């Protein structure tokens, strides 16, 4: 369920990712491996790296669920970015692809793409996966990137809401970005901003979540945020408890991440991140392993900075 190591390049990183997803001892023993439903390289690379497209199906822990995910490896040598684009959906059909164009439109109720930033070089990587969700963390070696997708854990019957699919990335996949970007929009899973996280409403409409407001972003998503890091909605001061959080007598508290929407029509609590938590930065930082009830959790920091409100931990089991 965990694949730590160093990938010689982005293509080798994707190869290792798929090999882990298809041959991990835990996945194969429990029969939780994902099925590759599509794999193709449509574009004719010019002044750019070969683009790999893969679509995979995840059956879930019980084997009764239907999860469809996609991964894309888009890069440009002349700009030396080798982005990895991620997206999710509910159905796939190769015949529905219009002539030319792209295949991601064929997904039923398709969603905007997210991505992770990397390039062709040896790169330490941190991999987590489970029958319902997968997490990718790539250490840029003095920068840290992260992304993932899967099912959140709602408080309502899956019989009525069986598809709580969530996709999160460090930066929006609608544009091409260089990993040395200097914009605030480049951050991690704990603090989505400017189309960095999407969740599928039970009505079937994907809703974006942002911890901070943005004029460029749509007005609808302003009302819906992540409360743990969005304490500024109710607090009347810039400085709050969350920014000043600290460990207690050598013990690091772990705070979950919540999915909440406050809409005019009504309110609703959606769920929590499975295996991701907010932790302080003091006397600690990246690659820190914190145990809990015999369970270890790794620490990571956003690309933007490594301060208190931009740092999170991920469960490694």
């Amino acid at each position: 369920a965990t694949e730590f190591g160093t990938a010689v390049n982005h293509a080798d990183l994707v190869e290792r990712l798929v090999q882990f997803l298809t041959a991990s001892p835990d996945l194969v023993a429990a029969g939780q491996a994902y099925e590759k439903v599509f794999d193709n390289t449509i574009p004719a690379s010019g002044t750019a790296i070969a683009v790999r497209q893969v679509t995979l199906r995840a059956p879930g822990l019980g084997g009764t669920d239907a999860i469809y995910m996609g991964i894309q490896s888009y890069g440009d040598t002349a700009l030396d970015y080798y982005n990895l684009r991620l997206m999710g959906g509910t159905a796939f059909n190769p015949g529905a692809i219009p002539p030319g164009g792209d295949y991601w439109t064929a997904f039923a109720n398709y969603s905007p793409r997210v991505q992770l930033l990397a390039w062709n070089q040896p790169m330490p990587y941190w991999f987590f996966a489970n029958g319902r969700r997968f997490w990718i963390v790539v250490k840029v070696s003095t920068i840290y990137e992260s992304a993932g997708a899967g099912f959140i854990l709602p408080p309502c019957p899956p019989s009525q809401y069986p598809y709580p699919l969530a996709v999160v990335g460090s930066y929006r996949g609608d544009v091409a970005t260089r990993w040395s970007d200097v914009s605030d929009r480049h951050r991690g899973i704990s603090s989505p901003y400017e189309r960095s996280c999407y969740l599928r409403d039970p009505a079937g409409r994907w809703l974006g979540f942002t911890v901070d407001g943005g004029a460029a972003n749509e007005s609808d998503y302003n009302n819906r945020t992540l409360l743990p890091l969005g304490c500024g909605r109710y607090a009347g001061s810039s400085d709050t408890v969350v920014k000043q959080l600290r460990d207690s007598f050598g013990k690091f508290p772990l705070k979950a991440l919540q999915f909440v929407t406050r809409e005019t029509e009504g309110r609703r609590y959606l769920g929590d991140f499975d295996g991701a938590f907010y932790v302080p930065t003091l006397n600690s930082g990246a690659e820190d392993v914190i145990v809990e009830d015999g369970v270890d959790h790794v620490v990571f920091q956003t690309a933007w900075r490594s301060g208190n409100p931009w740092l999170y931990a991920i469960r490694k089991d």
Binding site: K251, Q258, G294
Partner: protein, 113 residues
């Protein structure tokens, strides 16, 4: 290093239609957190202890009971109602039996024993 956080009474007794959440891990302790490598990151690792949990482990890893009180009122014709149970355990929870008391005339169709 780190052994246990606790939170056994609260979550187990919390307002959950499930229960016994994250309980199998308690006995399954294991642990190899100690040990640090040098991918030219920085030599930093302090304390590394246990504290707190998600605090929202709600609704995890056992059956459900959606119906709690049925208002049948006046019964004059053959009524049919749904009964569902959702198990989130990684292993099945087998029902011991259904001891039917004063339930004569109530039957389930399409289901085994």
């Amino acid at each position: 290093e780190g052994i246990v956080a606790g939170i056994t009474p609260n979550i187990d007794a919390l307002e959950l239609n499930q229960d016994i959440s994250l309980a199998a891990v308690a006995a399954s302790t294991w642990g190899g957190a100690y040990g640090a490598h040098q991918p030219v990151e920085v030599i930093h690792s302090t304390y590394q202890a246990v504290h707190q949990s998600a605090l929202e482990e709600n609704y995890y890893n056992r059956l459900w009971l959606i119906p709690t009180a049925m208002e049948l009122g006046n019964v004059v014709s053959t009524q049919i109602r749904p009964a569902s149970v959702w198990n989130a355990y990684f292993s099945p929870r087998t029902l011991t039996a259904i001891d039917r008391e004063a339930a004569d005339g109530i039957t389930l169709s399409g289901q085994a024993s």
